[PDB]
Amino acid sequence: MNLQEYQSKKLMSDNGVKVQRFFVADTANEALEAAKRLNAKEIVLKAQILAGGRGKGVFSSGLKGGVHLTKDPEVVGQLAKQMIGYNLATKQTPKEGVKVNKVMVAEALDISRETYLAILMDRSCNGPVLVGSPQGGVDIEEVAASNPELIFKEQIDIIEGIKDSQAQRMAENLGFLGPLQNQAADQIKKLYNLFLKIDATQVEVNPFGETPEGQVVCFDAKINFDDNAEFRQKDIFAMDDKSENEPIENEAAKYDLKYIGLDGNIACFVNGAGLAMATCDIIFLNGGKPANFLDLGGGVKESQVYQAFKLLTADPKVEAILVNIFGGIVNCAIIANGITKACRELELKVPLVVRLEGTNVHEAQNILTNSGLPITSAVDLEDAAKKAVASVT
Amino acid sequence: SYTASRKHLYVDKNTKVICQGFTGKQGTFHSQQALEYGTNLVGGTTPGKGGKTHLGLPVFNTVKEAKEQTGATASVIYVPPPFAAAAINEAIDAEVPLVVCITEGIPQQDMVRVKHRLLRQGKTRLIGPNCPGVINPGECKIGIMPGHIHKKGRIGIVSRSGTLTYEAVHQTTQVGLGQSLCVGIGGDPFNGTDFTDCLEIFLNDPATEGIILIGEIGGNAEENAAEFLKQHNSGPKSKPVVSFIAGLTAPPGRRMGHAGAIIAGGKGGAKEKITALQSAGVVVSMSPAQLGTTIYKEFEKRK
Numbered sequence: 185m186n187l188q189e190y191q192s193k194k195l196m197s198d199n200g201v202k203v204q205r206f207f208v209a210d211t212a213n214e215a216l217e218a219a220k221r222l223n224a225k226e227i228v229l230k231a232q233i234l235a236g237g238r239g240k241g242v243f244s245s246g247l248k249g250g251v252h253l254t255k256d257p258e259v260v261g262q263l264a265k266q267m268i269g270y271n272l273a274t275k276q277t278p279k280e281g282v283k284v285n286k287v288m289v290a291e292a293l294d295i296s297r298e299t300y301l302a303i304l305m306d307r308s309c310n311g312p313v314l315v316g317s318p319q320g321g322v323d324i325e326e327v328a329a330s331n332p333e334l335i336f337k338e339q340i341d342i343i344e345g346i347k348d349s350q351a352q353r354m355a356e357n358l359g360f361l362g363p364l365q366n367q368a369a370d371q372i373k374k375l376y377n378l379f380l381k382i383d384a385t386q387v388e389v390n391p392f393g394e395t396p397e398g399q400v401v402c403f404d405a406k407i408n409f410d411d412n413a414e415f416r417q418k419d420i421f422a423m424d425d426k427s428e429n430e431p432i433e434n435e436a437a438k439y440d441l442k443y444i445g446l447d448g449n450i451a452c453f454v455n456g457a458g459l460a461m462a463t464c465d466i467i468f469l470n471g472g473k474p475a476n477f478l479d480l481g482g483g484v485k486e487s488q489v490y491q492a493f494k495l496l497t498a499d500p501k502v503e504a505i506l507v508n509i510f511g512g513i514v515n516c517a518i519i520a521n522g523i524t525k526a527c528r529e530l531e532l533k534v535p536l537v538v539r540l541e542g543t544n545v546h547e548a549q550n551i552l553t554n555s556g557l558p559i560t561s562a563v564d565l566e567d568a569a570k571k572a573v574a575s576v577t
Numbered sequence: 578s579y580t581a582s583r584k585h586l587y588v589d590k591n592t593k594v595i596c597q598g599f600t601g602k603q604g605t606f607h608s609q610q611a612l613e614y615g616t617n618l619v620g621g622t623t624p625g626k627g628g629k630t631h632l633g634l635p636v637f638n639t640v641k642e643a644k645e646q647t648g649a650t651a652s653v654i655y656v657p658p659p660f661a662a663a664a665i666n667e668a669i670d671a672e673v674p675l676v677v678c679i680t681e682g683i684p685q686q687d688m689v690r691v692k693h694r695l696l697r698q699g700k701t702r703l704i705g706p707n708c709p710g711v712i713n714p715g716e717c718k719i720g721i722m723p724g725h726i727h728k729k730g731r732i733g734i735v736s737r738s739g740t741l742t743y744e745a746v747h748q749t750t751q752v753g754l755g756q757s758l759c760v761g762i763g764g765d766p767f768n769g770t771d772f773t774d775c776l777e778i779f780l781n782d783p784a785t786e787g788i789i790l791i792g793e794i795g796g797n798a799e800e801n802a803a804e805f806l807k808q809h810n811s812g813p814k815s816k817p818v819v820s821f822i823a824g825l826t827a828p829p830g831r832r833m834g835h836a837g838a839i840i841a842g843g844k845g846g847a848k849e850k851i852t853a854l855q856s857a858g859v860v861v862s863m864s865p866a867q868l869g870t871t872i873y874k875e876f877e878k879r880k
């Protein structure tokens with residue numbers, strides 16, 4: 185899922201993590217009153233869109249720049265008037281931009297020292313890990329490439345929790361000194377608790393730094409959430425912003441389908457994550473480009489097959505559909521029925537390459553044979569990939 | 578140590594199995610299929626339904642009562658994600674030698690806590706979660722894999738993907754090699770059994786003469802497997818190892834269906850895993866459809 189800057193920073197603030205003071209406004213007058221209530225020396229107005237490059241973006245109103253600094257609350261309201269309800273186009277958006285419904289009115293903070301700090305689950309050490317670097321404000325794996333001595337890690341025991349010696353050592357390795365080191369150590373402990381509380385896969389703060397006035401602040405952050413934990417994080421997943429997503433992926437999300445759009449023209453209908461990845465791989469190895477990844481496993485129901493198939497046929501890029509099922513818990517006849525009925529109330533118009541194996545495959549092939557659909561049956565993975573590639577321009 | 582439970586991976590005809598989530602939808606169905614296959618399914622658990630019968634077998638309120646009353650040595654878990662971690666923990670608490678968790682969708686943080694207890698005992702061996710299970714062809718099936726494609730043979734198969742296990746099984750059966758033991762370790766980022774655990778069993782098993790290792794993007798288990806093979810599968814009597822790694826074309830930063838299948842921070846890519854495995858003497862099949870033929874050629878060239 186995705187959160188706006190104001191959503192993740194509010195999540196951090198509500199759990200004792202220090203961020204810049206801010207309000208969110210839905211109208212220009214709301215932004216003006218928010219700027220007045222801030223009582224801040226300098227104010228930053230930020231359009232709320234997920235994509236990056238807001239600083240160099242252009243609004244459909246003609247206003248240049250999605251991030252503006254000013255000391256006058258009336259300027260905040262006037263500039264917000266040229267922001268809200270307009271589209272903001274940046275280097276990372278489609279050329280028609282993204283509609284800005286909300287702006288952030290925040291206290292503008294000066295930054296005198298930047299560090300990197302992230303918290304995630306370490307697969308090798310089977311527990312949470314603190315990953316920090318005193319070289320903040322840049323790409324982290326860039327630092328790891330040229331200065332691996334500047335990456336510091338603290339492995340944390342999940343049952344023991346974060347220890348004060350772990351928080352203090354990381355704050356020291358990040359470069360914080362004296363009272364600012366104690367402040368940073370305490371913020372690391374509150375970032376750790378937040379990380380566990382919200383079932384995050386990663387809380388990444390960059391820059392994790394300090395103001396000239398001697399406050400340790402999380403100036404910007406990104407939080408990735410564990411999708412497996414949505415059932416116990418519904419209040420956070422309710423905040424999900426799907427307005428900048430691939431619209432087909434939004435449709436897939438409505439039906440709990442694992443769909444990832446790609447740039448090819450061969451649609452993939454697969455019942456396993458490994459097989460679907462392998463299907464994309466073998467299409468590429470035989471000269472094709474897959475249009476999507478699709479993992480439809482578990483106790484799949486015919487209605488899920490019906491929707492997924494309609495989803496693939498709604499993609500204008502798709503010139504052919506490769507169905508590849510090795511069913512174990514998946515009953516192949518459920519696949520065959522969902523596809524045949526889908527092609528009834530949809531009028532199939534692209535080549536259909538089908539390969540079925542496993543649970544109840546013989547009954548499933550009989551459903552396809554008696555369907556009269558234009559099907560090209562495949563023999564194995566290689567045959568399926570070559571036949572699908574042969575079906576497209 | 579937890580590595581002492583590695584031997585519990587090798588189910589056989591004398592393995593006795595209980596089912597956690599026995600009365601549920603998938604627990605009932607695959608319990609039926611296990612009985613029709615010949616698996617010694619002796620009962621199962623569902624909290625609050627102990628004292629009932631299900632498929633002619635006793636239902637119990639706890640794993641411990643089920644274990645004591647049937648002598649079960651293995652448990653398979655069909656428990657929904659919100660409770661499956663507690664179902665694993667109960668089986669560890671009952672000291673069930675082998676636990677197989679099929680459930681997909683367990684919170685990662687839950688499994689981090691499960692692994693904390695798991696790694697500090699040596700009685701219980703956990704396969705999964707998010708896995709198809711384990712099968713000894715013609716002796717014992719614990720999981721969801723289609724039994725009719727299997728054939729008792731001499732290839733050991735370990736895989737992070739259930740569907741790719743079926744591919745390898747079907748191909749090795751078609752060429753006549755068959756399978757000694759198949760272990761699907763699942764596609765989650767935190768689980769109870771990795772490649773090295775299965776490789777240790779395969780190298781010491783006389784019935785296993787060749788190995789198929791199936792991996793994918795994410796983590797470093799394939800890299801750890803390569804290091805294990807460099808140190809323990811050299812020597813004069815090495816066993817041939819064929820591999821396929823999924824996700825050569827996967828985009829970065831996205832979890833590809835599996836919770837553990839993601840390239841992030843310049844780590845987890847399939848190409849590095851292919852290179853690591855090849856440096857350990859593994860013959861990596863470029864195509865997933867050629868696993869059976871690739872290891873067949875290795876058996877032919879080895880006379």
Ligand SMILES: CC(C)(COP(=O)(O)OP(=O)(O)OC[C@H]1O[C@@H](n2cnc3c(N)ncnc32)[C@H](O)[C@@H]1OP(=O)(O)O)[C@@H](O)C(=O)NCCC(=O)NCCS
Nearest residue numbers: 482598600601602603655656657660680681707708709739
């Ligand atoms: C585990 C899974 C299969 C369960 O789905 P399901 O069988 O349709 O669900 P159900 O609700 O019908 O059955 C679950 C049962 O477990 C029971 N249960 C709950 N907590 C339990 C516990 N601690 N111990 C034992 N049983 C428990 C429930 O009461 C329920 O039984 P009931 O209906 O008799 O009351 C599903 O969540 C899942 O993970 N599916 C995907 C699996 C997959 O594809 N894995 C990868 C293979 S490679």
Ligand SMILES: [Cl-]
Nearest residue numbers: 580773777805
């Ligand atoms: Cl070892």
Ligand SMILES: [Mg+2]
Nearest residue numbers: 456457481482
């Ligand atoms: Mg799967």
